[PDB]
């Protein structure tokens, strides 16, 4: 078929004898051979626009300040916690002793075991930083 030749950013135009036509505004085609361009994702509500939509790529969403993206292609907005905390059902809770979190997102991780590498502990870990091992 002649449609297969139409590249990303265009669609095989059924209204004009299968010519390649540029994608209309608010639409994209990140692949070739499409007969229609896909509608761009609207980054609104809890979502905010990070990368605007173009004929060759979909709009990429971000979250509202105090929140971070969850899942593939920013499908959800998860609440930010402080460094040295993690998110639970009852909100942000400090890392338990022996665990840390150097990020405003994610869970508390136990400190690295220096003794495993035959290394000494030079600086003990905290709630926000991992242990610093010797040489």
């Amino acid at each position, epitope marked *: 078929d002649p449609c297969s030749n139409c590249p990303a950013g265009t669609f095989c135009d059924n209204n004009r004898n299968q*010519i390649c036509s*540029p*994608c209309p505004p608010n639409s994209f085609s990140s692949a070739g051979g499409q007969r229609t361009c896909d509608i761009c994702r609207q980054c609104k509500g809890v979502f905010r626009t990070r990368k*605007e939509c*173009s004929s*060759t790529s979909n709009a990429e969403c971000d979250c509202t300040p105090g929140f971070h993206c969850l899942g593939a292609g920013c499908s959800m907005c998860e609440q930010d916690c402080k460094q040295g905390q993690e998110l639970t059902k009852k909100g942000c809770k400090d890392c338990s002793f022996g665990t840390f979190n150097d990020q405003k997102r994610g869970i508390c991780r136990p400190w690295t075991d220096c003794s495993l590498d035959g290394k000494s502990v030079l600086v003990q870990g905290t709630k926000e930083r991992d242990v610093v091992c010797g040489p």
Partner: antibody
Amino acid sequence: EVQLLESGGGLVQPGGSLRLSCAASGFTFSYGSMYWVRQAPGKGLEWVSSISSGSGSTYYADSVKGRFTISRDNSKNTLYLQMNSLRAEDTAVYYCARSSYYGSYYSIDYWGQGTLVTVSS
Amino acid sequence: DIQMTQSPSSLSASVGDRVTITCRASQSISSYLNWYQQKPGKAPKLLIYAASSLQSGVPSRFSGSGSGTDFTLTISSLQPEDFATYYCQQYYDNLPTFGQGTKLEIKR
């Protein structure tokens, strides 16, 4: 504010080459097309070349096909027209243009001021 | 290729008069037809798109008609500012051919 500015126009000897530039501002070339349209003194508008956004798919009028090349340097937001094997019939004001989307298709809406190309010895 | 034949090449008509400009395509172009107005020293201005759709900011005196091969531009009541060269342009095949133009003189 959408602004288009052509440069590179001037006197050129028949058989020669000339490269036109069209500097754009006030928009991102993420949708539609950009064009080159020429006008011979006292004659009608002649569409010569098109370039699609994203892909950079090009189209040429039969009158310039094989001699002229349209290209876009997005990093510099500059549209080019490389014009080879020029003859007296190529003498014209050369305009770069930008599309707008009306009634389910892209068509010429914005025009630059033009650059005069004279093919003479 | 797609050829665009405009009729007539030129015409003279008085302020208040009604004029019609023809545009014929060598093959069917559905409604993918534009009308532009070119005044001396000014960039061409889009008057009509999709054969009959009047562009916003364009007076109701300018009107379009047609589908396929035969197209018509009419100006219902000419003004002195209407002096220009009118061009049709087809957008059916990625090679947007302009009509040869119609030069409109205002009679006085």
